[PDB]
């Protein structure tokens, strides 16, 4: 009975990170984690890493869509934070972002890593941006790499 | 390691704004903000700015879809307010509006700026229409411009 | 009837930022915002940007006074955080800082941007240092540039 | 992009300390901290350190003004404690003291360090006079030195 | 009666920093503080500063032990954060870390600076990583330098 | 200024895992995580992985001590669970185990990874054995590898 377990190391890869600058106070750490992950762990040569700042998290799809359709990249890591406010604006951003990104991956066949924090408080976001609950940035980066290989293995 | 940071200035652009006239009391300020942003900040020549009033916010997609498929515009800024009422009508308007718009952008490759307020009270809308919490109109306008360049940079 | 609306782009400008290192955990993001604002948005060439770290926020005036009297700069952005403690020390720091800076601008005719957080909690400061409520750093930077032009227009 | 970070060491400096004798039980430790800071850390030769006792904290300005107009000193450290009492006397002392001092620095161009405790209780003053919350004396002394260099660097 | 007061300036020194990457969101500021302290204050030439990232805070001892036994360094600054969780895991990490480090110093005769935050909340860690309660990174760095001299003075 | 960041890949390594069979219901997943980590991520050839079952978690030290003194291994990963009961037996097990292990590492210079759960409830242990809070097994395994390299880099 045959099995596929992939590895996160994948040096000959070219990876794109899309970050939202809104909330960058958090997103910065989110990046640091991802970049480090990519290079130090997945052996990515850091001139194959390209980083694209879009303004809001809402833009992440369009941006990563471009990058995937480009064919220039083996996977896109999508980094952002969306913290809930007084209105249901939170709902539609994080929604049209989750689904936007998921769609892009499904059509382009390129892995997209969902490294978007969707919290209730600034507190929680800090917790997932490189503290108690690890670093969703580095985590999304890793799941990106593994995915490259997982796919490549078919 | 290469990076893309875009700028909001983009004078040779032609931009389309779609506004819902329902709730115009708020949407009017939403516009003023956007228009000013576009011209004063993004250097847009104001005969490249075209403004399209549709009746409800629910119509924003169809209207912007037309504009994007037209190819005549580099980006569409979508302006509107949807305040929660006694029924779940609020849900389906803001929903089919967030997703409608998000889709149009994804297919047309044209950036669509989601400057649609989705509040609980008239109070909250006023807060986001050019007071305490800035002006989502001008903000959506800016994210539109930055996106033009962000894309252009690939 | 004649009107003056200025723009935030002003590339041939030389700008000075004064930062307090006390509370730098927050002030760092405050900076990043401002710097990015200046260059990416206001087209400032980054060797016309000079950054001066003073120890406490209380020192911001004297420091920016020097810079303005110097005439070497078109405007000074003042960055710092002052969080309220158990004593009224908070009052006199933020006071002697608001008024110190405001005075310097008034005598030197050089614009001084008041990008000093004055919060009740660490929580609030984080909110204004590049999260929910934007980035008072980049905001102060922008109001600086706009001012340059607003003045220049007379 | 050019930056100014200063150092606290500045041996060839001549510094003046003005202390209020009222509340000396606290102010004494306030001094010790400062003096030690100055010499041991900032390398100040202790015959360039001069110490001036005024009676109340209210007098700190006039005294430091003299010293700064004198030109004999590179900076003045102002040490004192003002604890809140039953009346609003507390308000006018700490007020006319914060602003007096701040003004002197602004006109004389000489750095003045605001090492005046402004507490609600004797308890709080003890906390900032060389216990849990460090020593505002030595802290004011250091911010003085750093300022000397920060200025000198323009 | 003879006395030893040391200074924090010690330029001809070679210093090693060991940081835990877990919780780096905080540890990053912890570092910045220390590095700045070292160079700007203690006059350390920044090619004599070496920085070693270990994964967990639990590893700090072993890593600093190596560095001290090496003899290549005059002191090691140990930076990390340990925030309390739902289990007593917190106890054994911070414990085996405090004692690990303390032991290494005692055997190697090399100063080891304990700049490890041991808090109850993310909130508290932020407070000690360069805000209200200063920067334990820079503070640990300073106590490192002073120690070098304190020892050297016997 | 020179820096050491290590990688978790280290294929030519020979690693020993010590597991306590008490509580194996949890420890089993703890292992699976570690083993997978080692091979799949750190490229360890799985005949260089040796696994040693000791009865209680209290024994983990003695067992790993032997293994490290043996010199046959580059690092030992210590896996086990200690859940708090009605008595303070919990205290002495987890204590004599944290310190035992930490000591072994310090004397043998071999890295020892502390992958011992120290929880209050069975619930919490399950959370850290490959669910919400990841898998301390695989985490301990990774910190082992990274350590090998971190040390090798001096």
Swiss-Prot record, chains A, B, C, D, E, F:
Catalytic activity: (2S)-2-hydroxy-3-oxobutyl phosphate + 5-amino-6-(D-ribitylamino)uracil = 6,7-dimethyl-8-(1-D-ribityl)lumazine + phosphate + 2 H2O + H(+)
Pfam families xrefs: DMRL_synthase
GO biological process: riboflavin biosynthetic process
EC number of this enzyme: 2.5.1.78
GO CC term (a single one): cytoplasm
Domain of life of the source: Bacteria
Keyword Transport in record: no
UniProt-annotated binding residues for (2S)-2-hydroxy-3-oxobutyl phosphate: 86-87, 128
Keywords: Riboflavin biosynthesis, Transferase
Gene Ontology molecular function terms on file: 6,7-dimethyl-8-ribityllumazine synthase activity
SUPFAM superfamilies in alphabetical order: Lumazine synthase
Protein role: Catalyzes the formation of 6,7-dimethyl-8-ribityllumazine by condensation of 5-amino-6-(D-ribitylamino)uracil with 3,4-dihydroxy-2-butanone 4-phosphate. This is the penultimate step in the biosynthesis of riboflavin.
Subunit-structure text: Forms an icosahedral capsid composed of 60 subunits, arranged as a dodecamer of pentamers.
NCBIfam families cross-referenced by the UniProt entry: lumazine-synth, PRK00061.1-4
Family statement drawn from the similarity comment of this UniProt entry: Belongs to the DMRL synthase family.
Protein name: 6,7-dimethyl-8-ribityllumazine synthase
Organism: Salmonella typhimurium (strain LT2 / SGSC1412 / ATCC 700720)
Native organism taxonomy: Bacteria, Pseudomonadati, Pseudomonadota, Gammaproteobacteria, Enterobacterales
